Amino acid sequence: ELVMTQSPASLAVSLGQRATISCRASKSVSISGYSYMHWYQQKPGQPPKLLIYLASNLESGVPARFSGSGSGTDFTLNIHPVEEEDAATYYCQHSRELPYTFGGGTKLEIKRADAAPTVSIFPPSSEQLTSGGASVVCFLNNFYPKDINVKWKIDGSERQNGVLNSWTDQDSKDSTYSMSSTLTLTKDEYERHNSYTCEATHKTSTSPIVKSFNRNEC
Amino acid sequence: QELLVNYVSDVRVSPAAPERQEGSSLTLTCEAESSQDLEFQWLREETGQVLERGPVLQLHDLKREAGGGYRCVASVPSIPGLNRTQLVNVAIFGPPWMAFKERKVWVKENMVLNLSCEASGHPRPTISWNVNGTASEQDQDPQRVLSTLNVLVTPELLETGVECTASNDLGKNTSILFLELVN
Amino acid sequence: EVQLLESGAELVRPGASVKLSCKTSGYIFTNYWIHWVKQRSGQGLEWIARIYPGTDITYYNEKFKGKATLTVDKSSSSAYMLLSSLKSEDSSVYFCARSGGYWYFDVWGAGTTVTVSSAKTTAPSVYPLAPVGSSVTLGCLVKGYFPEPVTLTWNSGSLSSGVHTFPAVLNSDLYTLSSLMTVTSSTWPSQSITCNVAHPASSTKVDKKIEP
Ligand SMILES: *[C@@H]1O[C@H](CO)[C@@H](O)[C@H](O)[C@H]1NC(C)=O
Ligand SMILES: *[C@@H]1O[C@H](CO)[C@@H](O)[C@H](O)[C@H]1NC(C)=O
Ligand SMILES: [Cl-]
Ligand SMILES: [Cl-]
């Protein structure tokens, strides 16, 4: 049909500078002076939101930081100066022919100063213990950059089975990341060891961040 | 060696691509950044006619024939010739509008013809013909299309003629071409 | 205000069908086109089809012919899409969107999640999490449910500053989700904090109070 190629796929720009996203169609989507190319913004959990219609026109309510330009096959979305809330995925779409297609999308990551994760650990509650199972959870919140490693230690020995991690997208306000790790096990074997340690290796500290608690100790 | 010279730029209309239902109203506003005070005027792109001076043009009870070109002119009074224009194209919702309802062609019998068919409407219409053959569509106005079809002059075509049907989501309109011969 | 409201999430067996709805308000429903798009696993956008409610005229993407059927009920000002003969590659979020004669989408619906699976609905287990500036962090773990999604709020949704609700993680056809809340040391356990969970697919609503 009619293909839209977005470049780049990922974009990391510091707050206050400019983001330039590109979109090239396999055929011209401009006729008679109208360029049937449109731009959308998509934040996590939310539907796509219209930014620019007909290549260059700003939708009412969209701040003047956003602008679009181009013609024929080449179009560019410009964001300047990028704010924290601009962390999202941006799509182009054409209405020249049918079927309507979209670009592959471009996710914008927002650079900020490095931040240490806030770590909290929680034991399996007794309401779960009335079911023969026991999950220990570890939250790691508001850190930068994205990359982080976490590691569960049961009495010094490493647990690798029964662990489920979960990462968030970049927060729209502090431009940080968060991670949740749950270690699921049978109650019996939870009651056969004492120490439960949640340790994390992040770029913020030379020493891996360790936070633990002991089962027998109350 | 720096220079500070007079200028007008950034002539923007609002709304940029208006779509209005028939009978509704439309309010167009013109904007321009320049190095002095500015005057504004509104034209009707297809005619020379001036409509209203100043930055805002208020239209009411829009008929289908009010669609198309409106041009804002952002001038400087103190500098003759220093202006800049910006065109806005308004689209009225309506069925297809044939540029001609019935028209007539003089032909010879050993001949092939490139026939044509214009139509207007919002959304932009498409045209089909009542004879076999691939026709090429030229879009030239966000609401106008010109279809072109090559037909061979045959007795059955002199008998029936040929008709183009312009269709859009709001309705259909038709137009016919008669074929008559050498003396 | 223009509003596009889509029906609830769906759990459909393979080969069966489903009829998604999109009820409109705030504008003349017969003056605007309704489009449906598909987004799988949060990335990408495919345009499915469009319908004009004034004249009942539909145009379909050839990718989706035989899969989608666009219907409109002017009585309730609602558009409908019928997905037929479902398989796993249909499990996605489907948006409805409004457009004019230039086919750009000014208003979008919230999105209906559709899960095509043979697995059965399972009610979640909601577990509170107690901790054992300079402030405290609480949590709430919902474990082993199907299908997506659930809704997790705190104090009926009245306290939203500081939430980190983490995406669901699929494990053995059962999902697991967890959320946290960080508030001042001055207000725990002074003020009382509840984790509110709602899993509509099993008709189970839960509120569990954290306490030391
Ligand atoms: C606007 O400027 C053009 C030349 O740029 C000139 O031909 C025209 O007469 C001017 N019109 C007005 C109203 O100043
Ligand atoms: C078809 O086009 C003619 C000429 O443009 C116009 O007068 C007529 O009203 C149109 N028919 C319909 C049904 O709109
Ligand atoms: Cl309306
Ligand atoms: Cl997709």
mmCIF file of C-alpha atoms in Angstrom, chain B residues 3-165:
data_model
loop_
_atom_site.group_PDB
_atom_site.id
_atom_site.type_symbol
_atom_site.label_atom_id
_atom_site.label_comp_id
_atom_site.label_asym_id
_atom_site.label_seq_id
_atom_site.Cartn_x
_atom_site.Cartn_y
_atom_site.Cartn_z
ATOM 1 C CA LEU B 3 21.177 45.290 8.869
ATOM 2 C CA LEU B 4 17.716 46.013 10.282
ATOM 3 C CA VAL B 5 15.177 46.282 7.451
ATOM 4 C CA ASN B 6 11.400 46.446 7.209
ATOM 5 C CA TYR B 7 9.450 43.245 6.684
ATOM 6 C CA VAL B 8 6.211 41.332 7.039
ATOM 7 C CA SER B 9 6.191 37.568 7.572
ATOM 8 C CA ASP B 10 4.367 34.683 9.241
ATOM 9 C CA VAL B 11 0.928 35.254 7.717
ATOM 10 C CA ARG B 12 -1.230 32.626 9.452
ATOM 11 C CA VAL B 13 -4.970 31.999 9.112
ATOM 12 C CA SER B 14 -7.182 30.450 11.776
ATOM 13 C CA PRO B 15 -8.710 27.985 11.431
ATOM 14 C CA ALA B 16 -6.232 26.649 8.871
ATOM 15 C CA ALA B 17 -8.445 24.094 7.055
ATOM 16 C CA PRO B 18 -12.054 24.832 8.014
ATOM 17 C CA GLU B 19 -14.807 22.270 7.481
ATOM 18 C CA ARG B 20 -18.319 23.662 7.912
ATOM 19 C CA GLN B 21 -21.784 22.248 7.397
ATOM 20 C CA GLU B 22 -24.121 24.075 5.039
ATOM 21 C CA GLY B 23 -25.976 26.838 6.862
ATOM 22 C CA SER B 24 -23.451 27.044 9.709
ATOM 23 C CA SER B 25 -21.139 30.017 10.303
ATOM 24 C CA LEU B 26 -17.404 30.549 9.979
ATOM 25 C CA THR B 27 -15.046 33.126 11.487
ATOM 26 C CA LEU B 28 -11.608 33.440 9.880
ATOM 27 C CA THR B 29 -8.797 35.361 11.602
ATOM 28 C CA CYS B 30 -5.538 36.505 9.996
ATOM 29 C CA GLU B 31 -2.209 36.891 11.782
ATOM 30 C CA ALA B 32 1.142 38.334 10.737
ATOM 31 C CA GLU B 33 4.434 39.309 12.375
ATOM 32 C CA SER B 34 6.064 42.461 11.024
ATOM 33 C CA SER B 35 8.270 45.447 11.854
ATOM 34 C CA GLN B 36 5.456 48.030 12.072
ATOM 35 C CA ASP B 37 1.700 48.382 12.323
ATOM 36 C CA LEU B 38 -0.229 46.381 9.743
ATOM 37 C CA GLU B 39 -3.423 46.562 7.724
ATOM 38 C CA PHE B 40 -5.401 43.448 6.800
ATOM 39 C CA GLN B 41 -7.776 42.678 3.937
ATOM 40 C CA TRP B 42 -9.716 39.663 2.663
ATOM 41 C CA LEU B 43 -10.080 38.568 -0.971
ATOM 42 C CA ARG B 44 -12.056 35.855 -2.787
ATOM 43 C CA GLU B 45 -9.234 34.004 -4.589
ATOM 44 C CA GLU B 46 -11.334 33.167 -7.652
ATOM 45 C CA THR B 47 -12.387 36.799 -8.110
ATOM 46 C CA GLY B 48 -10.673 40.091 -7.483
ATOM 47 C CA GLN B 49 -13.473 41.074 -5.105
ATOM 48 C CA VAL B 50 -12.540 42.494 -1.705
ATOM 49 C CA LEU B 51 -14.798 41.247 1.101
ATOM 50 C CA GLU B 52 -13.914 42.955 4.409
ATOM 51 C CA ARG B 53 -10.858 44.811 5.672
ATOM 52 C CA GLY B 54 -9.237 44.032 8.990
ATOM 53 C CA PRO B 55 -8.034 40.718 10.403
ATOM 54 C CA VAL B 56 -11.377 38.877 10.845
ATOM 55 C CA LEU B 57 -13.862 37.762 8.164
ATOM 56 C CA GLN B 58 -17.281 36.592 9.367
ATOM 57 C CA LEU B 59 -19.322 34.311 7.103
ATOM 58 C CA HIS B 60 -22.906 33.208 7.737
ATOM 59 C CA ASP B 61 -25.429 30.787 6.235
ATOM 60 C CA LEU B 62 -22.769 29.123 4.117
ATOM 61 C CA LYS B 63 -24.048 27.832 0.814
ATOM 62 C CA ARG B 64 -22.025 25.288 -1.149
ATOM 63 C CA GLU B 65 -20.779 28.075 -3.459
ATOM 64 C CA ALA B 66 -18.926 29.837 -0.610
ATOM 65 C CA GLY B 67 -16.226 27.154 -0.501
ATOM 66 C CA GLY B 68 -12.676 27.522 -1.739
ATOM 67 C CA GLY B 69 -10.243 30.404 -1.907
ATOM 68 C CA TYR B 70 -10.065 33.204 0.639
ATOM 69 C CA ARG B 71 -6.863 35.247 0.731
ATOM 70 C CA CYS B 72 -5.710 37.433 3.611
ATOM 71 C CA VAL B 73 -3.515 40.412 2.710
ATOM 72 C CA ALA B 74 -1.282 41.762 5.503
ATOM 73 C CA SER B 75 0.032 45.156 4.359
ATOM 74 C CA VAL B 76 1.952 48.042 5.903
ATOM 75 C CA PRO B 77 0.330 51.464 5.328
ATOM 76 C CA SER B 78 3.616 53.365 5.639
ATOM 77 C CA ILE B 79 5.379 51.283 2.952
ATOM 78 C CA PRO B 80 3.643 50.888 -0.442
ATOM 79 C CA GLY B 81 4.051 47.380 -1.830
ATOM 80 C CA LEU B 82 5.181 45.791 1.464
ATOM 81 C CA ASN B 83 2.705 43.007 2.150
ATOM 82 C CA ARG B 84 2.341 39.236 2.196
ATOM 83 C CA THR B 85 -0.624 37.008 1.405
ATOM 84 C CA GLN B 86 -1.907 33.719 2.781
ATOM 85 C CA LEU B 87 -4.581 31.490 1.262
ATOM 86 C CA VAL B 88 -7.172 29.524 3.229
ATOM 87 C CA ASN B 89 -9.382 26.872 1.626
ATOM 88 C CA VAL B 90 -12.789 26.338 3.258
ATOM 89 C CA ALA B 91 -14.593 23.039 2.666
ATOM 90 C CA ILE B 92 -18.386 22.822 2.794
ATOM 91 C CA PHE B 93 -19.947 19.414 3.328
ATOM 92 C CA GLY B 94 -22.071 18.438 0.342
ATOM 93 C CA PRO B 95 -22.737 15.934 -2.456
ATOM 94 C CA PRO B 96 -20.670 16.030 -5.666
ATOM 95 C CA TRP B 97 -21.059 19.088 -7.896
ATOM 96 C CA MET B 98 -20.606 18.537 -11.631
ATOM 97 C CA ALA B 99 -18.714 21.219 -13.547
ATOM 98 C CA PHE B 100 -21.090 20.571 -16.447
ATOM 99 C CA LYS B 101 -24.412 18.752 -16.535
ATOM 100 C CA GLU B 102 -24.771 18.046 -20.268
ATOM 101 C CA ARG B 103 -22.334 18.862 -23.072
ATOM 102 C CA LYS B 104 -21.785 17.925 -26.703
ATOM 103 C CA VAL B 105 -18.826 16.755 -28.806
ATOM 104 C CA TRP B 106 -18.337 16.757 -32.597
ATOM 105 C CA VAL B 107 -16.343 13.717 -33.764
ATOM 106 C CA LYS B 108 -15.232 11.595 -36.718
ATOM 107 C CA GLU B 109 -15.850 7.851 -36.823
ATOM 108 C CA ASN B 110 -12.271 6.487 -37.026
ATOM 109 C CA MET B 111 -11.261 8.381 -33.914
ATOM 110 C CA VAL B 112 -10.358 7.892 -30.254
ATOM 111 C CA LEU B 113 -11.121 10.701 -27.797
ATOM 112 C CA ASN B 114 -9.728 11.840 -24.442
ATOM 113 C CA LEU B 115 -12.911 12.837 -22.609
ATOM 114 C CA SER B 116 -12.926 14.717 -19.307
ATOM 115 C CA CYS B 117 -15.160 15.196 -16.269
ATOM 116 C CA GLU B 118 -14.778 17.713 -13.427
ATOM 117 C CA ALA B 119 -16.582 17.572 -10.088
ATOM 118 C CA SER B 120 -16.419 19.199 -6.658
ATOM 119 C CA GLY B 121 -17.553 18.246 -3.169
ATOM 120 C CA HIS B 122 -16.439 17.538 0.397
ATOM 121 C CA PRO B 123 -15.215 14.878 0.936
ATOM 122 C CA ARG B 124 -13.388 15.010 -2.388
ATOM 123 C CA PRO B 125 -15.408 12.930 -4.877
ATOM 124 C CA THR B 126 -14.358 10.148 -7.220
ATOM 125 C CA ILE B 127 -15.630 9.624 -10.765
ATOM 126 C CA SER B 128 -16.481 6.474 -12.722
ATOM 127 C CA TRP B 129 -17.551 6.028 -16.337
ATOM 128 C CA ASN B 130 -20.203 3.879 -18.007
ATOM 129 C CA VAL B 131 -17.757 2.336 -20.531
ATOM 130 C CA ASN B 132 -14.906 -0.105 -19.985
ATOM 131 C CA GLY B 133 -11.416 1.360 -19.758
ATOM 132 C CA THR B 134 -8.945 2.575 -17.144
ATOM 133 C CA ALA B 135 -9.393 6.271 -16.368
ATOM 134 C CA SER B 136 -6.796 8.483 -14.704
ATOM 135 C CA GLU B 137 -7.760 10.814 -11.860
ATOM 136 C CA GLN B 138 -6.021 14.169 -11.418
ATOM 137 C CA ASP B 139 -6.578 15.875 -8.075
ATOM 138 C CA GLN B 140 -6.149 19.636 -8.338
ATOM 139 C CA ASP B 141 -8.191 21.243 -5.490
ATOM 140 C CA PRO B 142 -8.739 19.469 -2.120
ATOM 141 C CA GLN B 143 -12.393 19.320 -3.229
ATOM 142 C CA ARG B 144 -12.042 19.023 -7.036
ATOM 143 C CA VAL B 145 -11.180 16.016 -9.214
ATOM 144 C CA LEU B 146 -10.767 15.762 -13.002
ATOM 145 C CA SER B 147 -11.262 12.297 -14.501
ATOM 146 C CA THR B 148 -9.878 11.466 -17.943
ATOM 147 C CA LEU B 149 -10.907 8.519 -20.124
ATOM 148 C CA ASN B 150 -9.961 7.445 -23.656
ATOM 149 C CA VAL B 151 -12.856 6.052 -25.714
ATOM 150 C CA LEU B 152 -13.020 4.863 -29.313
ATOM 151 C CA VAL B 153 -15.806 6.353 -31.434
ATOM 152 C CA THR B 154 -18.089 3.382 -32.182
ATOM 153 C CA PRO B 155 -21.704 3.369 -33.436
ATOM 154 C CA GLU B 156 -23.024 2.173 -30.066
ATOM 155 C CA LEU B 157 -21.258 5.105 -28.398
ATOM 156 C CA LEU B 158 -22.783 7.631 -30.802
ATOM 157 C CA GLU B 159 -26.099 5.995 -29.897
ATOM 158 C CA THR B 160 -25.818 5.999 -26.094
ATOM 159 C CA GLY B 161 -23.324 8.752 -25.514
ATOM 160 C CA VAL B 162 -21.125 8.491 -22.437
ATOM 161 C CA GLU B 163 -21.706 9.494 -18.821
ATOM 162 C CA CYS B 164 -19.392 10.056 -15.860
ATOM 163 C CA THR B 165 -20.696 9.468 -12.324
#
